[PDB]
Amino acid sequence: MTEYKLVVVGAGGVGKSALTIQLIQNHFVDEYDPTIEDSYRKQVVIDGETCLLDILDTAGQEEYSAMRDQYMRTGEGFLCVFAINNTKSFEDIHQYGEQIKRVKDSDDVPMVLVGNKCDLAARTVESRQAQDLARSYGIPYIETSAKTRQGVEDAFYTLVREIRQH
Ligand SMILES: Nc1nc2c(ncn2[C@@H]2O[C@H](COP(=O)(O)OP(=O)(O)NP(=O)(O)O)[C@@H](O)[C@H]2O)c(=O)[nH]1
Ligand SMILES: [Ca+2]
Numbered sequence: 001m002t003e004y005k006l007v008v009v010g011a012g013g014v015g016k017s018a019l020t021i022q023l024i025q026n027h028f029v030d031e032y033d034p035t036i037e038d039s040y041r042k043q044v045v046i047d048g049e050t051c052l053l054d055i056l057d058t059a060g061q062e063e064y065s066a067m068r069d070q071y072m073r074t075g076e077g078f079l080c081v082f083a084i085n086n087t088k089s090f091e092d093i094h095q096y097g098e099q100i101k102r103v104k105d106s107d108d109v110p111m112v113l114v115g116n117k118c119d120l121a122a123r124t125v126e127s128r129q130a131q132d133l134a135r136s137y138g139i140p141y142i143e144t145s146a147k148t149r150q151g152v153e154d155a156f157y158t159l160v161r162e163i164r165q166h
């Protein structure tokens with residue numbers, strides 16, 4: 001079957017794992033569980049076609065930047081996650097976007113910019129700000145809550161469609 005190599009990137013704690021676990025295991029559990037590097041392979045049907053989502057869930061820890069080159073090198077499309085209550089994580093996702101472009105020698109990489117934790121009240125990143133960044137990349141912006149599942153399928157399946165339409 002068609003395989004889609006999806007990589008979930010972003011600063012520590014923005015909800016990269018929570019998003020992936022909601023998609024694959026249909027649940028949210030509030031818990032502290034930092035990622036080193038985890039792989040989820042799930043066969044899905046998207047728009048009538050069977051495909052294998054090969055999802056790499058990465059670490060937000062700054063001490064892993066050398067290891068980021070490797071999975072950016074081999075990754076097909078990227079969920080670029082920040083949290084809407086964490087302005088620093090929004091600044092950081094600019095750096096991820098630039099690194100993806102440098103490692104892959106391309107500004108045509110399928111990506112979706114994801115503003116996660118949209119269930120939370122203390123918003124500090126406005127949607128228009130994130131939309132401006134996504135426009136500069138030519139990519140969609142989608143808000144998500146791993147907690148409520150709002151936008152989760154939207155974000156992952158839109159990334160698949162962005163790859164498929166590449
Ligand atoms: N309210 C709310 N909390 C969330 C959401 N997504 C994740 N969290 C919470 O935020 C924390 C970090 O989530 P996690 O998925 O582990 O983040 P991560 O980006 O994978 N971290 P790491 O880079 O260390 O692997 C956890 O307490 C988790 O329960 C969300 O959409 N809403
Ligand atoms: Ca181009």
Ligand SMILES: [Ca+2]
Nearest residue numbers: 138139140162
């Ligand atoms: Ca597009």
Ligand SMILES: [Mg+2]
Nearest residue numbers: 016017034035
């Ligand atoms: Mg994680």
Ligand SMILES: [Mg+2]
Nearest residue numbers: 102103104105
């Ligand atoms: Mg280069």
